[PDB]
Amino acid sequence: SPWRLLGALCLQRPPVVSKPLTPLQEEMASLLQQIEIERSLYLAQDLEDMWEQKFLQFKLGARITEADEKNDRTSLNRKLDRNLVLLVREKFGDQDVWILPQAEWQPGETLRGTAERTLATLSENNMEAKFLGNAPCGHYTFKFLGAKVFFFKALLLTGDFSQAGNKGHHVWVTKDELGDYLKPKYLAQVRRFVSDL
Amino acid sequence: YKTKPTHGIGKYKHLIKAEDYEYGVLNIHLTAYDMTLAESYAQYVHNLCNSLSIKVEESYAMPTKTILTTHERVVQISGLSATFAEIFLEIIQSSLPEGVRLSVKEHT
Amino acid sequence: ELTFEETERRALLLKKWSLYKQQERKMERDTIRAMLEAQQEALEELQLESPKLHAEAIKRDPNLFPFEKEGPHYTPP
């Protein structure tokens, strides 16, 4: 039977900023600090004042660059405390669905080669990605002539995402907007293999 | 007794062992600014390993080096499946707390 | 020396962290099982739809031996 060969890639951007501590974790931090003080085994004022003013003079880099934008979905720095996933709008001849970046593959090209091609096929940038294994993460088959789509996985080491204002609709989705943007069951189940954490 | 049907009912040494693509010996090196953080992460990774049924051999440490000091830890790992290695490594990546250096180096 | 109220608060903190990390380990295990079964059903579908690709799906990438990936920070470059 005529089969429509299609692969894909669920790119993963790891969090550059660790998640902020909950008040429960802050209470545990206080408890561990006080037990550490209890278990501890043995002009300072001027030094403390100088060191605290050294702390005060420099402003710490904001852990959240997200509240100011509210519209920069295309920006690579949409979120910092969580993983990000690339997601680009696509328009087919018979369909128009917000679809994870896919690609067409041939039997002369392996799945790893298809993923490596897809790394720069649609973003036209100099992004640096890393692969773990040939094992995929999700498979979804929708027919009209058979077809299949393989959602793979990759991790971003560094990225020179030039011309961020691309003609595409790349919107970085962490966990929540996946259901909002991908309605059909064949595309709303990506969160099963997306690291929700 | 040898002739009796109960022969060998008391043997035990056969139950004691005293001595398909898979990895080899894997060393995870954890260098950290904090003794407490390094120890906690070593405990966490060891718990993950013995909950996922990973043969862990050693959890020793390198000697301290001064040029402040950085504490070093080692986790030994042996036995990985295709998807199992991927899931293990990605869980480690997503569970690294703060400013610690991982490693997948080998022996020697 | 310590008082009774602080000991009770310590016990409550231990209980609440017990519950919190219990939920944490539970959700981590749920993610593990969910994505593992997703990968297994993906492999089964790949075997069913391609008898010549499941043989090369099991092989490992040889670039994982010198693997390296840094963790998170607070202030990005």
Binding site: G61 | - | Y74, P77
Partner: peptide, 29 residues
């Protein structure tokens, strides 16, 4: 005693460390 000192290696990545004599700011040259 240990204190939460912020440390930076070469690029400006503040990290909390348990360090004696709370400096609140460290920068490796």
């Amino acid at each position: 005693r240990l204190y939460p000192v912020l440390l930076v290696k070469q690029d400006g990545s503040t990290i909390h460390i348990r360090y004696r004599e709370p400096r609140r700011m460290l920068a490796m040259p």
